[PDB]
Coordinates of C-alpha atoms in Angstrom, one line a residue:
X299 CA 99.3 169.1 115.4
X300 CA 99.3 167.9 119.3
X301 CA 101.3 170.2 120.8
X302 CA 102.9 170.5 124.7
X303 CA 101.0 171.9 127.1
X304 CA 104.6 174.1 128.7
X305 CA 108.1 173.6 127.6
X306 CA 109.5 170.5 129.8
X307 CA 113.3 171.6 130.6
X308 CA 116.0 168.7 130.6
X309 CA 119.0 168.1 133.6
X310 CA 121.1 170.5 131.7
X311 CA 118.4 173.3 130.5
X312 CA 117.3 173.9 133.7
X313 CA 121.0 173.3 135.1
X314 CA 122.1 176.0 132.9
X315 CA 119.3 178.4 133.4
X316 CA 119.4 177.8 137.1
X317 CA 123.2 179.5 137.1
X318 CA 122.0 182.4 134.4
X319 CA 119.0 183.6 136.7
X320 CA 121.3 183.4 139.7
X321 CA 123.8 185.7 137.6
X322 CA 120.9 188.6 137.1
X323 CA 121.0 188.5 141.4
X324 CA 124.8 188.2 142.3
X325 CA 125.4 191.0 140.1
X326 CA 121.8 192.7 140.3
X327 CA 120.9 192.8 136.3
X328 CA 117.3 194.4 134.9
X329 CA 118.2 192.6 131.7
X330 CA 115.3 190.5 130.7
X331 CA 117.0 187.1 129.2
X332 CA 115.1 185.0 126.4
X333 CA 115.6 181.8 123.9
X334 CA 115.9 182.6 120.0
X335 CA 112.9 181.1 118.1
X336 CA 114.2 177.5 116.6
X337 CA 114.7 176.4 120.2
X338 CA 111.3 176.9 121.6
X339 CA 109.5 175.2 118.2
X340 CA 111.0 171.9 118.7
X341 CA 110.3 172.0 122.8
X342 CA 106.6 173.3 121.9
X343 CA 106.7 170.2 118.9
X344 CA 107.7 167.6 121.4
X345 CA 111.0 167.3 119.8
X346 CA 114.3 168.7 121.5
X347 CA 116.9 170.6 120.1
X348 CA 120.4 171.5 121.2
X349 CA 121.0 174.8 119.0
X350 CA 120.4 177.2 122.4
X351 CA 119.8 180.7 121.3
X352 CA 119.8 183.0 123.9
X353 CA 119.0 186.7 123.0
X354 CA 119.7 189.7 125.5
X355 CA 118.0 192.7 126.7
X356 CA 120.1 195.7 127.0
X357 CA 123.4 194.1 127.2
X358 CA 125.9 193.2 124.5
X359 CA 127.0 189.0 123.5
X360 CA 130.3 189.6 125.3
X361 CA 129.3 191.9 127.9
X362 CA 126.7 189.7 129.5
X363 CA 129.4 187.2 128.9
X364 CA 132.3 188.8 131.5
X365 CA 129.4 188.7 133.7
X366 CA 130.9 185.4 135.1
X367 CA 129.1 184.4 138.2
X368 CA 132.2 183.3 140.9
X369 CA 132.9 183.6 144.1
X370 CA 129.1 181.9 145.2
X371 CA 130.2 178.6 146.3
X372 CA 130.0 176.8 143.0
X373 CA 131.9 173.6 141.8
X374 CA 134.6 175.9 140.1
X375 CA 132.7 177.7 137.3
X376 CA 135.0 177.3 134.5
X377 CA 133.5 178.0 131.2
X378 CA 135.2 175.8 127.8
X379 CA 134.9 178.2 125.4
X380 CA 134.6 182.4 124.9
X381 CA 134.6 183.0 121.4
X382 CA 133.8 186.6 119.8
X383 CA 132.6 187.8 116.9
X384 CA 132.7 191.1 115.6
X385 CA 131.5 192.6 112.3
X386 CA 132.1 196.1 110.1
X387 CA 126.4 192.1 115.6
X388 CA 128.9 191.5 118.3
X389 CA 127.8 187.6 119.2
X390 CA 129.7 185.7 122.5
X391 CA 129.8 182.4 122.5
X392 CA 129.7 180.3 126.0
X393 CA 130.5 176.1 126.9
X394 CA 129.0 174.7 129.5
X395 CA 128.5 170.9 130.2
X396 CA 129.6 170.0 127.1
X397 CA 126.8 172.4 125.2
X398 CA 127.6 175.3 122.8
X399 CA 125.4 178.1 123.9
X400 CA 125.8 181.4 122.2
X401 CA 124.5 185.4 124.0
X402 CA 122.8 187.2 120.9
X403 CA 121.8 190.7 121.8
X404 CA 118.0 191.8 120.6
X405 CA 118.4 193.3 117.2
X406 CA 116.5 194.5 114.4
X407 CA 117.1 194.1 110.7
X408 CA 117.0 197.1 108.2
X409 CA 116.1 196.8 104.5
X410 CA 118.2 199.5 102.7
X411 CA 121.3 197.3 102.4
X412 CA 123.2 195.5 99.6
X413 CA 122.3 192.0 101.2
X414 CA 125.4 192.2 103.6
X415 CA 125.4 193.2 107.4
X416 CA 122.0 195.3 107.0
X417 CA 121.6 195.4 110.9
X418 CA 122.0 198.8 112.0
X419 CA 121.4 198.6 115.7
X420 CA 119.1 196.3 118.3
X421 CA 115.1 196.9 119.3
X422 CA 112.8 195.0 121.2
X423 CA 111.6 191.6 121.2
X424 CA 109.1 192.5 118.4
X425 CA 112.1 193.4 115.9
X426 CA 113.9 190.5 116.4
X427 CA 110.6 188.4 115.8
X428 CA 109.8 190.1 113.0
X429 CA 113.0 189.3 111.5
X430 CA 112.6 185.8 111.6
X431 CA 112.4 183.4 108.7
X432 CA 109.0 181.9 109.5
X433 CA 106.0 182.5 111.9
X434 CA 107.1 179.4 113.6
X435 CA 111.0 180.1 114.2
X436 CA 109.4 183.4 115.7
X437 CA 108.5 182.6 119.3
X438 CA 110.5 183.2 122.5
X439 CA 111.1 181.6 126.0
X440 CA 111.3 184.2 128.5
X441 CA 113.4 182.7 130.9
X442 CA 113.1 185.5 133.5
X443 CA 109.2 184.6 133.2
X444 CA 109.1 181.2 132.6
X445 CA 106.2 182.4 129.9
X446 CA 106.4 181.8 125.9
X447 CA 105.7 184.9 124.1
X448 CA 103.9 185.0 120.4
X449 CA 104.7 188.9 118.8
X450 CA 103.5 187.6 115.7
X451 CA 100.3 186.4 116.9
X452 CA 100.6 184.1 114.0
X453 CA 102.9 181.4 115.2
X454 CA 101.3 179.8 117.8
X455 CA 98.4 179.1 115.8
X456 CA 100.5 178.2 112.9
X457 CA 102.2 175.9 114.8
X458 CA 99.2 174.2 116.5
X459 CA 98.1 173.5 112.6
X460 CA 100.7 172.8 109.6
X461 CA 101.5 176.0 107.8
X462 CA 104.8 177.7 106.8
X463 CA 104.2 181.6 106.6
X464 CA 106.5 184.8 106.7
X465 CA 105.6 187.2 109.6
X466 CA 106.1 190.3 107.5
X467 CA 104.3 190.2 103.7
X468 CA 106.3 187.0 102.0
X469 CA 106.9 188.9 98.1
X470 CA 108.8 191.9 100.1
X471 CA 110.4 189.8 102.0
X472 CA 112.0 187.8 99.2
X473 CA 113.1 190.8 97.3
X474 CA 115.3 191.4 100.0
X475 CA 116.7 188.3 101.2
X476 CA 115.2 185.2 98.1
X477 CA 117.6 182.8 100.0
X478 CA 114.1 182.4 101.9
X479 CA 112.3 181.0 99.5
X480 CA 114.5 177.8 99.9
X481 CA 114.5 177.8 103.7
X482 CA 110.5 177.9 103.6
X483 CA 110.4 174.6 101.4
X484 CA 113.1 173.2 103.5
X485 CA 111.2 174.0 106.8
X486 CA 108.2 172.9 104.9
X487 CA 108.6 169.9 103.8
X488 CA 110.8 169.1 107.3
X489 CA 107.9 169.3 109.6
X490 CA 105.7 168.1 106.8
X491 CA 103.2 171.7 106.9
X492 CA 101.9 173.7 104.4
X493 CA 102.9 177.2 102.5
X494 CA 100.5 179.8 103.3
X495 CA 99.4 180.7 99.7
X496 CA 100.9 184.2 99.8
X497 CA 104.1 182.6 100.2
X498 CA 103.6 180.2 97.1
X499 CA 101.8 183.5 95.2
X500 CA 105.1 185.1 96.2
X501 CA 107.3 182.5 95.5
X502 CA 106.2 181.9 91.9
X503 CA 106.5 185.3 91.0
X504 CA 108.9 186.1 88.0
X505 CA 110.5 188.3 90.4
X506 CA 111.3 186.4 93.2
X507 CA 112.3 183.6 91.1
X508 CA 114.7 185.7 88.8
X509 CA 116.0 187.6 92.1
X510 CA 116.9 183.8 93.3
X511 CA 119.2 182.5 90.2
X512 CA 120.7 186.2 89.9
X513 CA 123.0 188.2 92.9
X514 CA 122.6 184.7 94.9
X515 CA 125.6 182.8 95.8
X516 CA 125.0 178.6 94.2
X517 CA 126.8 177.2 97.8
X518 CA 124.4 178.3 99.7
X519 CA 121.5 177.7 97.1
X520 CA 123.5 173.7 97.0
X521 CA 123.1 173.9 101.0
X522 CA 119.7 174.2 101.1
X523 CA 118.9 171.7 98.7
X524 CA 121.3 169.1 100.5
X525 CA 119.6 169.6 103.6
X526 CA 116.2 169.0 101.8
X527 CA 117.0 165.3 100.0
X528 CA 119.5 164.9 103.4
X529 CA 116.1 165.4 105.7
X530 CA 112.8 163.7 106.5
X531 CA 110.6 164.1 103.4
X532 CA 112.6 165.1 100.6
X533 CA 109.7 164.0 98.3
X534 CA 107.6 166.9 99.5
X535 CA 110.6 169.7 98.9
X536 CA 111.0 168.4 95.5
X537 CA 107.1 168.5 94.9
X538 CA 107.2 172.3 96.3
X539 CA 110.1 172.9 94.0
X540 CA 108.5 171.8 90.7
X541 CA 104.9 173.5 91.6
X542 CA 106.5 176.9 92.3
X543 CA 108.5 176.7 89.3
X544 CA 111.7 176.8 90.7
X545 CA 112.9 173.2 89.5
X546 CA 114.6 174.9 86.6
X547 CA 116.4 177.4 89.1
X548 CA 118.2 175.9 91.7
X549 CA 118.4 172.8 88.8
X550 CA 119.6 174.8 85.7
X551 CA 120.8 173.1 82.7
X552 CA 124.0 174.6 80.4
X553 CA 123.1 176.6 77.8
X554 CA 124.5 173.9 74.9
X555 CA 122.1 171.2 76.7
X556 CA 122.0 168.3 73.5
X557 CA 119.3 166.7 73.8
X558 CA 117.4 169.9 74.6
X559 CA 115.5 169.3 78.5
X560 CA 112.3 167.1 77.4
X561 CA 109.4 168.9 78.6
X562 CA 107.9 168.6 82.6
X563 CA 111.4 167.0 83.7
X564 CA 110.2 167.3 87.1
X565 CA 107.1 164.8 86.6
X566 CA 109.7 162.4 85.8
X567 CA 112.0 163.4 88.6
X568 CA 109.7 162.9 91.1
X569 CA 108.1 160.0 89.9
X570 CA 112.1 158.1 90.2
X571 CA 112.5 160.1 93.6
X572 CA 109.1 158.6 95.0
X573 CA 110.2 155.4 93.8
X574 CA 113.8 155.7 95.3
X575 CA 112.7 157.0 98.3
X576 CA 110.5 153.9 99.1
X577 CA 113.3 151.6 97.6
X578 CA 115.5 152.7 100.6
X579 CA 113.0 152.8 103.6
X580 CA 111.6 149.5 103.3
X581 CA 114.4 146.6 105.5
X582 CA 115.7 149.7 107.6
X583 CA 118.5 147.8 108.4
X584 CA 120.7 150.8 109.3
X585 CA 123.7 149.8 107.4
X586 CA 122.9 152.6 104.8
X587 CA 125.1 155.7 105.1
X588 CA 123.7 159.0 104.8
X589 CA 125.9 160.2 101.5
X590 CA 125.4 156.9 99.3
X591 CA 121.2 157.3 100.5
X592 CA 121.5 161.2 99.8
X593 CA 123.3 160.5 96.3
X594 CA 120.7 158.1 95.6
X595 CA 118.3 160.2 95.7
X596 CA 119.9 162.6 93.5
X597 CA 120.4 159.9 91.0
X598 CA 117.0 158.9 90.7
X599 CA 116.0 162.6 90.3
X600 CA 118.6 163.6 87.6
X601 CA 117.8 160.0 85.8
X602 CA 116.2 161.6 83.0
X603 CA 119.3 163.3 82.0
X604 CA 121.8 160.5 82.0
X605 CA 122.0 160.5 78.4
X606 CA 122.5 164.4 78.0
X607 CA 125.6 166.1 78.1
X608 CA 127.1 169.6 77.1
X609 CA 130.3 170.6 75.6
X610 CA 132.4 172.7 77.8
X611 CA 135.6 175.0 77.0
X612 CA 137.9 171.9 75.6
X613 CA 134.5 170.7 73.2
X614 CA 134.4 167.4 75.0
X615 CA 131.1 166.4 75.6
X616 CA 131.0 166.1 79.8
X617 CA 127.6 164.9 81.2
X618 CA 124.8 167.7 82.1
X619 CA 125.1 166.7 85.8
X620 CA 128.2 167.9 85.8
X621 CA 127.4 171.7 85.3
X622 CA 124.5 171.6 88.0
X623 CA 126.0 169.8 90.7
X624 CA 129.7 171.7 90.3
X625 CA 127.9 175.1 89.1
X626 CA 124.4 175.3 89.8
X627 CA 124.8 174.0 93.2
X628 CA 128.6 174.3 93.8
X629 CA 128.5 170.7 95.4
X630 CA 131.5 168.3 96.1
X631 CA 133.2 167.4 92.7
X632 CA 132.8 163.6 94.3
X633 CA 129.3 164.0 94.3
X634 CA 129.1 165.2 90.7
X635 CA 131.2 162.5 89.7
X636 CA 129.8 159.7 91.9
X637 CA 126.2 160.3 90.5
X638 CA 128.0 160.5 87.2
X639 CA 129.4 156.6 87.8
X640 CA 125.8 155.4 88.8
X641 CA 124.1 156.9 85.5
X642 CA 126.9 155.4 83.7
X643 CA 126.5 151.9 85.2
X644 CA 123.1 151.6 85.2
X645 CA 122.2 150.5 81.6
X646 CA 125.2 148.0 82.1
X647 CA 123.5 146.5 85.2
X648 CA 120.0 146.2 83.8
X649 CA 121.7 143.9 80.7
X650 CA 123.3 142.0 83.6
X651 CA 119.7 141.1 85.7
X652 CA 118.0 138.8 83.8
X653 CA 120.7 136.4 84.3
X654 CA 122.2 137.3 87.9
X655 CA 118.4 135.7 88.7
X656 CA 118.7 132.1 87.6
X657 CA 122.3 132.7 87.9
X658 CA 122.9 131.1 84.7
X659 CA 124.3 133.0 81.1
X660 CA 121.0 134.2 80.1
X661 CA 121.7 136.0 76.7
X662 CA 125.4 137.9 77.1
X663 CA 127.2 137.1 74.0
X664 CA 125.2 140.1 72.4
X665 CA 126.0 143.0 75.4
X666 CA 127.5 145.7 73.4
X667 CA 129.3 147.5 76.5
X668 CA 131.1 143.9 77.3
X669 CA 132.4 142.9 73.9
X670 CA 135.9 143.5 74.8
X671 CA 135.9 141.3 78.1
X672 CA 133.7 138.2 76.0
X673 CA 136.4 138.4 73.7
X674 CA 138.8 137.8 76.6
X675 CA 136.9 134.8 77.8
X676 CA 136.3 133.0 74.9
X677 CA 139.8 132.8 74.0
X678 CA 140.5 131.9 77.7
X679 CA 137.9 129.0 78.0
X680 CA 138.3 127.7 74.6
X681 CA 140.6 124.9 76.0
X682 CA 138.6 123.9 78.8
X683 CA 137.0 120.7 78.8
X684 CA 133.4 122.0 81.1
X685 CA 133.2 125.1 82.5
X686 CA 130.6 126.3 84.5
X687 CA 127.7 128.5 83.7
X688 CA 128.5 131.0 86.2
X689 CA 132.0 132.3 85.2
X690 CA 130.6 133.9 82.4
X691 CA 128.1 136.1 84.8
X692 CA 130.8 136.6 87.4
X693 CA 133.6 137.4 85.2
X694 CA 131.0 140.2 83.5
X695 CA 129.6 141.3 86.9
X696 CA 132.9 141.0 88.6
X697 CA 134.1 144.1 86.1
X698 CA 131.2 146.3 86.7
X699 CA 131.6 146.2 90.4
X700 CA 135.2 147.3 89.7
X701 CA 134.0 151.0 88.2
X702 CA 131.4 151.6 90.9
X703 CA 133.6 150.6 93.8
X704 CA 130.9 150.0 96.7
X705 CA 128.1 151.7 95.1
X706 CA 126.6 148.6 93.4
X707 CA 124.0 148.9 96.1
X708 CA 122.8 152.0 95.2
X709 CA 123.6 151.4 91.4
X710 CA 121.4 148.2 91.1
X711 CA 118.1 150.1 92.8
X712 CA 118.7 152.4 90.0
X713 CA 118.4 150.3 87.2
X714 CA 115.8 148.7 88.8
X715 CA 113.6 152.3 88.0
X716 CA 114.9 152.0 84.2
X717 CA 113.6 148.5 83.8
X718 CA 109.8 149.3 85.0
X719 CA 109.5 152.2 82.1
X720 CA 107.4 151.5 79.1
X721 CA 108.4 152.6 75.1
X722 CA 107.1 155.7 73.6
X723 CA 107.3 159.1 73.9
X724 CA 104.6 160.1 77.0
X725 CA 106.1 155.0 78.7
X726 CA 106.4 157.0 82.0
X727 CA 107.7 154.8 84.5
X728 CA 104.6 153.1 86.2
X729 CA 105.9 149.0 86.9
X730 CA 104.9 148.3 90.5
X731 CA 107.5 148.1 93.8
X732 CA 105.8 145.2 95.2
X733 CA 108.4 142.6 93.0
X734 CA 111.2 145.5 92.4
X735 CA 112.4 144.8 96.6
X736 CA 112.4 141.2 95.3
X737 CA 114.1 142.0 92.5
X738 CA 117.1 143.6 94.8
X739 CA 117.1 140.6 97.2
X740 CA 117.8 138.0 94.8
X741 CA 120.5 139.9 92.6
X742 CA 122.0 141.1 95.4
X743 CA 121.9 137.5 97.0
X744 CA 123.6 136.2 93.4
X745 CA 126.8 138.6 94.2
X746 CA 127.2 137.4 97.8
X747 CA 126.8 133.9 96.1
X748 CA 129.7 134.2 93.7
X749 CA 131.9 135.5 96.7
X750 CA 131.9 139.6 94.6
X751 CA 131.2 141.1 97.9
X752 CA 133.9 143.9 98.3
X753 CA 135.0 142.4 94.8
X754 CA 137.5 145.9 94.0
X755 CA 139.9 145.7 97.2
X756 CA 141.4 142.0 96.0
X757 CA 144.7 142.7 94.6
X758 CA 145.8 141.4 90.9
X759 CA 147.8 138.1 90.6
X760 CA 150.5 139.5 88.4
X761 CA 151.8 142.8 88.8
X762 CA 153.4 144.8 86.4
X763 CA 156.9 144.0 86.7
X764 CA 156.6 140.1 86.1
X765 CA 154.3 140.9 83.3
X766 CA 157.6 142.0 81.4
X767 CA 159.3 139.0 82.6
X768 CA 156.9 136.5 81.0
X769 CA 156.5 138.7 78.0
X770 CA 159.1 139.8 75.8
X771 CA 160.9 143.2 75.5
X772 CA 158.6 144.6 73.2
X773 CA 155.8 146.6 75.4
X774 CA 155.6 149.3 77.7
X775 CA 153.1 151.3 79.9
X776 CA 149.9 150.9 77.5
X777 CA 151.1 146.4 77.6
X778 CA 150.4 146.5 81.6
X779 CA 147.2 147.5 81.7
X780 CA 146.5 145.4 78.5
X781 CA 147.5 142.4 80.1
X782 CA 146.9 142.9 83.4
X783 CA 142.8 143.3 82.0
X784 CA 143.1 139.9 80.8
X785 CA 144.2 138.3 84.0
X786 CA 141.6 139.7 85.9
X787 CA 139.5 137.9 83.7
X788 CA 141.2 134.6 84.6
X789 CA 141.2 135.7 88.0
X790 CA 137.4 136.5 88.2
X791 CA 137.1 133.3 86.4
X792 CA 139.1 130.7 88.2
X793 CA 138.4 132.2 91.9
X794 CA 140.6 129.4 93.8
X795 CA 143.3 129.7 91.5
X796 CA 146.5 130.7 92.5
X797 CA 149.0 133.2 90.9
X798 CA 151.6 130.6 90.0
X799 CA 148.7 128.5 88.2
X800 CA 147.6 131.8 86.4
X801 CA 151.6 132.1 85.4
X802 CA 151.6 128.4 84.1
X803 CA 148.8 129.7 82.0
X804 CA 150.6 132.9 80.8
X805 CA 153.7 130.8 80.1
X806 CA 152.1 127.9 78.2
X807 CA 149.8 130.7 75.7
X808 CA 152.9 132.8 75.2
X809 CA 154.7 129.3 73.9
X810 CA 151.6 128.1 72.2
X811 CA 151.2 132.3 70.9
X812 CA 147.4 132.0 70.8
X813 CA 146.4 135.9 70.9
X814 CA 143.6 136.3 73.5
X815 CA 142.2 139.9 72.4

């Protein structure tokens, strides 16, 4: 890796630092002041950072924090914020120029503890580098020397090349806090470096990996893994995460899993997250919201179980990715159930393709999940004279971007991956990505042709009350819906018609009573 020569300092940095070394002379401090490790790894990486860590000698968060330096002929030193933390260490936190910069004192971290405030008391710089994560978050900036100091004579040189290691021995380390192992694949696949292989010995270790899916809270276990497909290479965390085995831990599948997991589920997970990953990198247009690209990605990676579901409490049959995004990662329930709709929609977008490419009706009398709405349009367009050979596609694909709202986008590049697998039982997904963008351009060129664009905000013709005025007495709650189903079919069918023309139509069948169903 090209690293920096010295850490450059910005108009602020320096700014700041400039009123923090004149505070150690108007008040005549010995304390030696220095940055916490994750600032001085981006400034050494060329990158910046604006998390500013600033750990102190022999002086407390708060105490070095009512060291305010006034009365020198400033431009009113008036700090933002003074937030204090306390605990059963104490942490201030300052705000200057618009930047959240918070005074930790130099501690150490103890190991006899039940995994809750362990820290005892503070030691010197060598304790609170030893505590660190990774070799690389271990490095400090002494301010008061200008100088960037390497305790762990590890971290420089494993930041100079690309390697992930512990600075105390990695399978004690995650007996004590496992949470680690997922912040080393994180940091890992972030930075695109290796594990040192006593970290991946550690990490595959029964041990570790039964001391990370017991006496470890699923939020944070969630967090890490959102930050991981919500980063730069998620492809690489998810590799790291099937090779040490621990797929099937952060990932884990109910108990009454029917169909039971097929065997090496991550080969086929990463195989769709590859292919989704370079599905959604290639226009860069920018228009592409970080939630619907991170649920993307966790579609294509739970695609091979879409079809299996377990029973819950109530012995309803709910979808598997329901137990691992609302219990095995304690997610959003909008993210369980918004990878739920894609799964769903998926198989009824692939039926849908072949025919959204000519844009003509290219075999869609014999779609099994669209019987009911066929049934409504033949008994609409039985008494018209011509009708075109695109109502039939829009009136189908106008209903499917009903269910998935405005995540068609997302939807159609997964059935895209799910029409590129071959039959069988080894059949792997293998087609090639060179015609699937192609694929995406023109269908999605089809639904901007047929004006479907934003196709679930257009209000109904009829509402519910007129409904009841054009029908008879007999009806009620269960009637709305029942017609109001069939209108949107004239709707979607007729797109410059106008609600009095689609009453004339209700009027006349009702007179005429030709049942539509």
């Amino acid at each position: 890796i090209e690293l920096k020569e010295n850490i450059e300092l910005t108009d602020k940095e320096r700014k700041i630092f400039d009123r923090l070394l004149s505070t150690l002379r108007y008040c005549n401090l010995d304390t030696q002041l220095r940055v916490a490790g994750g600032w001085v790894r981006d400034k050494l990486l060329g990158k910046e950072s604006d998390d500013i860590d600033i750990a102190i000698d022999n002086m407390s968060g708060s105490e070095f924090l009512d060291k305010f330096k006034e009365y020198l002929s400033s431009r009113d030193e008036e700090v933002q914020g003074d937030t204090v933390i306390e605990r059963n260490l104490e942490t201030a936190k300052l705000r200057i120029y618009d930047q959240w910069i918070d005074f930790v004192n130099l501690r150490s971290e103890e190991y006899t503890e039940n995994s809750r405030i362990p820290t005892m008391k503070f030691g010197t710089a060598k304790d609170d580098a030893f505590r660190r994560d990774l070799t690389i978050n271990s490095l400090f900036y002494n301010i008061n020397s200008g100088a960037v100091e390497d305790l762990t004579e590890r971290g420089i040189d494993d930041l100079k090349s690309g390697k992930i290691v512990t600075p105390l021995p990695a399978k004690a380390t995650f007996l004590d806090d496992p949470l680690r192992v997922l912040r080393a694949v994180r940091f890992g696949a972030r930075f695109g470096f290796t594990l040192d292989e006593e970290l991946k010995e550690a990490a595959s270790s029964e041990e570790v990996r039964v001391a990370l899916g017991e006496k470890i809270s699923r939020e944070r276990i969630g967090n890490e893994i959102d930050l991981m497909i919500s980063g730069n290479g998620p492809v690489s965390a998810v590799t790291y995460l099937s090779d040490l085995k621990l797929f099937s831990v952060v990932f884990a599948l109910p108990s009454s899993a029917e169909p039971s997991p097929p065997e090496n589920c991550g080969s086929l997970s990463q195989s769709y997250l590859e292919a989704m990953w370079s599905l959604l990198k290639t226009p860069r247009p920018g228009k592409f919201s970080g939630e619907q690209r991170r649920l993307a990605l966790y579609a294509a990676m739970f695609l091979p179980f879409r079809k299996t579901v377990y029973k819950d409490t109530k012995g309803k049959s709910i979808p598997v990715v329901n137990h691992i995004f609302k219990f095995s990662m304690k997610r959003k329930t909008s993210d369980a159930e918004t990878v739920m709709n894609i799964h769903q929609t998926t198989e009824r977008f692939r039926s849908l393709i072949p025919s959204l490419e000519v844009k003509k009706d290219v075999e869609l009398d014999e779609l099994t999940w669209a019987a009911d709405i066929l049934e409504h349009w033949k008994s609409i367009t039985l008494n018209d004279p011509v009708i075109p050979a695109t109502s039939k596609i829009r009136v189908l694909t106008g209903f499917l971007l009903r269910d998935i709202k405005d995540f068609w986008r997302v939807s159609l590049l997964t059935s895209l991956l799910l029409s590129a697998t071959v039959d069988g039982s080894n059949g792997q997904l293998d087609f090639q990505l060179e015609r699937m963008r192609e694929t995406y351009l023109t269908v999605e060129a089809t639904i901007h042709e047929l004006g479907l664009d934003k196709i679930w905000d257009a209000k109904p013709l009829v509402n519910g009350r007129e409904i009841m005025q054009i029908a008879e007495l007999k009806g009620g709650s269960r009637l709305i819906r029942e017609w109001q189903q069939k209108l949107l079919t004239w709707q979607l069918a007729y797109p410059n018609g106008t609600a009095e023309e689609c009453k004339e139509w209700m009027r006349d069948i009702k007179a005429k009573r030709q049942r539509i169903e």
